[model samples]
Target chain A: SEFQINEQVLACWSDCRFYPAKVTAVNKDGTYTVKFYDGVVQTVKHIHVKAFS
Target chain B: SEFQINEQVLACWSDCRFYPAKVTAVNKDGTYTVKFYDGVVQTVKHIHVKAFS
Candidate 1:
């Protein structure tokens, strides 16, 4: 589920660790362009992310 | 929760739409470097992401 462009989010790393990130864009696909606090951007998959606790 | 580097995940795009992405790295600041399916990298924020549904 997309939040807002530039909206901050916590994502689950493949290492099984959850971290914070921001929404960058809404791609034509069902993925999103997200930039982590670290300054990297990539398309995310389904259910790999969730709302704040 | 961190999955694995390159692990796919779903994130909020601010618009409130969910998207898929992959983890690229683990930062020392507790952030993660993620790569989206579209091939982008970004630093994610906190409580903005979640695990697979």
Candidate 2:
């Protein structure tokens, strides 16, 4: 599977909270630039994300 | 937040089952390249993943 910019999904945080977020960008090396519902930006790996289940 | 390659995490899928996965790579654009316990490789968004809950 692959991630696309603008795709909304779920991401995890340090304190065990998973937030709803969007893929804002796709890096050339296979990472995703994401913007969370809380307005936080992050770069993460695939096993680190997925479809909104 | 960000992810390092080989970090274990949770990845959401179609059926509401978030599988155990490993961060195989972090892409340049901010997406992660992951490998699941089932041997599936996927590129997913951060919002769709997190530390295993």
Candidate 3:
């Protein structure tokens, strides 16, 4: 599942916990580059991420 | 749920996908340190982790 840019999401940064984050970019391989509320930038796969729905 | 050290679990490392992993340590705060089959070690909270049935 490819999320649009700037999509709000709960991203996994540490362990399996999900925190508020924003999608900055979507890679061609379906990975996403996200910026966490902690100001940590991470590249994540779709499986490890979920939208704020 | 406080899992004992050396417990086998399906860890969420990416997205929401759970993969085979092993608990290496249990913290006093009730978190767990796990090593994924891929050799990735991470510390996780109980909410985002579960044991293998």
TM-score of chain B of 2: 0.82
Model 1 / residue B51 / CA error / Å: 22
Give one digit per residue, the lDDT tens place, for model 1 in B3-43: 66777767555334557867777676777666666676666
Q: Candidate 1 lDDT, tens digit per residue, A1-53?
A: 46777777676554345668788886667676777777877567645666645
DockQ of 2: 0.05
DockQ list for all candidates: 0.06, 0.05, 0.38
lDDT of 3 by residue, B1-53 (tens): 47777889878866556787899998888788999987999888876687685
Can you give the TM-score per candidate against the true fold?
A: 0.44, 0.47, 0.59
- Ten residues in sequence with the least summed lDDT for candidate 3 chain B: B9-18
User: Candidate 2 at residue A5, lDDT?
Assistant: 81
Please provide, for model 3 over A1-41, each residue's C-alpha lDDT reduced to its tens digit, 9 standing for 90 to 100: 47789889888765556788898998988788999877899
Evaluated with DockQ, which candidate comes out highest?
Answer: 3
What shift in Å separates residue A44 of candidate 3 from its native position after superposition? 1.7
Cα lDDT of model 2 by residue, B1-53, tens digit: 78788899888653346788899998888678889877888787766678865
Chain B TM-scores across candidates = 0.68, 0.82, 0.83
